[PDB]
Specification:
heterotetramer; A: 115 residues; mainly beta; Immunoglobulin-like; four-stranded antiparallel β-sheet; 0% helix; globular; B: 379 residues; mainly alpha; Na+/H+ antiporter like fold; 2 domains; 18 helices; 3 strands; binds 1H-indol-3-ylacetic acid; Auxin_Efflux_Carrier (chains B, C); auxin signaling pathway (chains B, C); Mem_transp_PIN-like (chains B, C); phosphoprotein (chains B, C)
Chain lengths: 115, 379, 379, 115
């Protein structure tokens, strides 16, 4: 298969818009759901955002963005989305998913930019 | 046959080793002097300061231009006949593993040549066999305990990819280990991470956590971690500077000055009596002397005292040793288990009971077995 | 005047002592190798196994029939001129105490003759002054550190009666200490008890607790407790068996056999490099090197390096020493503070800061002061 | 003065009688009140009974004889008494007082015997 991630949804948008990121998982073994999301500025000390973990029972939202970022799972399409609302200007960092199949596989391709 | 005065030279060189060992077994088991945290401060001192200065003292006084190369090939053909049959056992028979190839290589070919082999064989045969045992300590420190370190690093780097990349590992391009991680075997949480590129390529980054690859990838991963265990190891500095000085001190006759030859000799004279004190502290802290079972203590001491010398009787004769050099070569092979093969097995958990039985129970039967060879060879 | 090659023999015998001391100051203060509980397991080993075998090795090789009795009286007249003026200071002046009589006797007359005096004076003057320093180590171990033990036991047995029998102690008949109690100074609760008899007599029993007497009573109480600190002391066995063997080994020429002369020499060869390692571990565990204040570190090192030798210049000349034996006697008096006077001051809390400054800060200025005497005496 | 204790009150008595022991203190310095009482059989491991300590506020009665042994102080006579009631047969041991003037001074002379 030569397993591949596909990420999109990033673009140029003002403050207080709406985004819905994509994480298209395709080619994997039996996937235990720990698909994450986190930020990365060119500065160090990154911080985690969300999760869609084991049964969708509890997600791990960060304390600054708790309850405002909507994450959802479709097991048939094998794609987890991240809805964004009330876009704060400190969201120019890159947002990529971290599907955990025993080792965290991750991609790089988005352009989440908030002016 | 042996004379009864030559039996006294063996006791003069071996009974001082057991006096230092029973005083430390007594000071923990019997008379309760050392707390087990105090007792682990003497092992710390010996492992870092006393044995790297004892092994420096022997290697720096060796003459690397006058090493007996016929004797030295019989010791390095023991460890090829053994290591070939283990390679042609794990590959042929399906029950063979790599956890036993490292164990049976330590149990049958790597004795205690530094602390009990140089004093023992010097009393038995003289000042030349105490000069031949230094030549083996040079080759264990610089070759055989740095190959065996590759076999533990390969054993650690093969578990981590079989556990975490079970169906994908054929596409790994590079494996970068972060510089914080020193041992990636069962000690740290080790949040690994892969990087899916545009055409199925995969960059793996092993990290520190808080809350079949190609052979060009593994042999880059092993050499990194071998290098990080080799510059933190105190007996690499003993072996580098010992060989570097004796290649200078024996070509240009540069005798080492008495500021430096006595600054090293003030802690290295501690080293042989502190090693036996530290070894007796260790056999008191363990709950049982035979710890691996009785069916494995007869296995740890048949690989050492029977399969050990009987593979240097087919190797010391194929090289061409005869006379006393045949007799030195067989008796040095029957020495008890070296402690540096145990120190690796404690860190990596590759049978730490068999390699602690064989050190402890090997010492206790070391003297009446090597004296049994010393009687049967001369007859 | 001194030749520049004789300055090299001093550095050959003294720089190996400071190499062993800075490696232990580095392994705690700088590079954090030893936990302070691990670090207290090496001090345990040195205090029990290494120094009682180092002091045995020197005393058993002494010839007690050929001791220089003129030199030996100048060292025992230092410690009478000092100890008479302290007796005629606490009795005359009302500010004098017994807590300073023990301190000023340790600070001015008891140097480090065993670990740094025998190697130092052997390099400065030769093999005879390394044979004269052994004769002082015999007299410190068997006389002056067993008198000073009477002065700590008397200091402990005088506090307990002044605190607890303030108006009644003139009628005490006997004082029985229970065999559990080893030190009755500020360590245990010590429920004492008296027994009023039919005519004002009083039997005192010191016990273990859970939840002016006549001189025939105190000198029975002191000798009991001195005996209980003298059979639990490891350097009494080093000094008893060392003198007992050398009185036999030098009259009937009984050379000690190589089973026993090497069983002792395997731990005693550790003893001089382990003492300096243990002494450098101690100066790293303390928060400050000068700990007693700066006005008392200039007092601890003026009693040692000025009042020490200037009272062996009025004693070594009244005996009749001249030439080199005058110069050996003054330079041995300027050695830094011995560690056994500190070990008593730690247990009894009789100024443990001045006697730890003088050990630690005394070692650091020991070499440029005794070399300053070695230049000024020969001129 | 040559300070002296006086103890009396002991004798032969059956079970369930009544005793009142005496501890006559005379000749002391300033006495801090810690006058005790305890038993001593020829067997070892003795055990304490009572106290009349600092202000008479709380006494330390043993758990087996709590509340039944009456102890009282007279500072003028300098004598502390110990009243005994419902005399159990395990009271043949010797009962002597232990006045504490910094060191516990004690005597020996009683014959408390319960048959
Ligand atoms: O150097 C070490 O890592 C430990 C070591 C090697 N040989 C020994 C003999 C006795 C005690 C410890 C050791
Ligand atoms: O023996 C002792 O109690 C301790 C001792 C005496 N001299 C010493 C020199 C260096 C280190 C410790 C000691």
């Amino acid at each position: 298969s030569q397993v591949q991630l596909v990420e999109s949804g990033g673009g140029l948008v003002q403050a207080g818009g709406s985004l819905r990121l994509s994480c298209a998982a395709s080619g994997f073994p039996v996937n235990i759901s720990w698909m994450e999301w986190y930020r990365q500025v060119p500065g160090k000390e990154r911080e985690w955002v969300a999760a869609i973990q084991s049964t969708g029972s509890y997600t791990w939202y960060a304390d600054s963005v708790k309850g405002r970022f909507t994450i959802s799972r479709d097991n048939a399409k094998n794609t987890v989305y991240l809805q964004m609302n009330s876009l704060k200007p400190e969201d120019t960092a890159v947002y990529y998913c971290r599907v955990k199949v025993g080792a965290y596989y991750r991609g790089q391709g988005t352009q989440v930019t908030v002016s | 046959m042996i004379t009864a005065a030559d039996f006294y030279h063996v006791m003069t060189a071996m009974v001082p080793l057991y006096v230092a060992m029973i005083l430390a077994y007594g000071s923990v088991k019997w008379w309760k002097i050392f707390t087990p945290d105090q007792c682990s401060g003497i092992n710390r001192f010996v492992a870092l300061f006393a044995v790297p200065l004892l092994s420096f003292h022997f290697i720096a006084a060796n003459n690397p231009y006058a090493m007996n190369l016929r004797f030295l090939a019989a010791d390095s053909l023991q460890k090829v006949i053994v290591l070939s049959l283990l390679f042609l056992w794990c590959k042929l028979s399906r029950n063979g593993s790599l956890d036993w190839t490292i164990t049976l290589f330590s149990l049958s070919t790597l004795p205690n040549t530094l602390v009990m082999g140089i004093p023992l064989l010097k009393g038995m045969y003289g000042n030349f066999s105490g000069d031949l045992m230094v030549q083996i300590v040079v080759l264990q420190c610089i070759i055989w305990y740095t190959l065996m370190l590759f076999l533990f690093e390969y054993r650690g780097a093969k578990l981590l990819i079989s556990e975490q990349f079970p169906d994908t590992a054929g596409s790994i391009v590079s494996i970068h280990v972060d510089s914080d991680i020193m041992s990636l075997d069962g000690r740290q949480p080790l949040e690994t991470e892969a990087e899916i590129k545009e055409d199925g390529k995969l960059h793996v980054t092993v990290r520190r956590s808080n809350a079949m690859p190609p052979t060009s990838v593994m042999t880059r991963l092993i050499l990194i971690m071998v290098w990080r265990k080799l510059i933190r190891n105190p007996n690499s500095y003993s072996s580098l500077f010992g060989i570097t000085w004796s290649l200078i001190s024996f070509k240009w006759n540069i005798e080492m000055p008495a500021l430096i030859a006595k600054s090293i000799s003030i802690l290295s004279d501690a080293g042989l009596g502190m090693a036996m004190f530290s070894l007796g502290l260790f056999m008191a802290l363990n709950p049982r002397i035979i710890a691996c079972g009785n069916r494995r203590a007869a296995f740890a001491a048949a690989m050492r005292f029977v399969v050990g010398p009987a593979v240097m009787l087919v190797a010391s004769y194929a090289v061409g040793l005869r006379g006393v050099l045949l007799h030195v070569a067989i008796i040095q092979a029957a020495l008890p288990q070296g402690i540096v093969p145990f120190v690796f097995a404690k860190e990596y958990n590759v049978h730490p009971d068999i390699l602690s039985t064989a050190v402890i129970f090997g010492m206790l039967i070391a003297l009446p077995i090597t004296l049994l060879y010393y009687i049967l060879l001369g007859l």
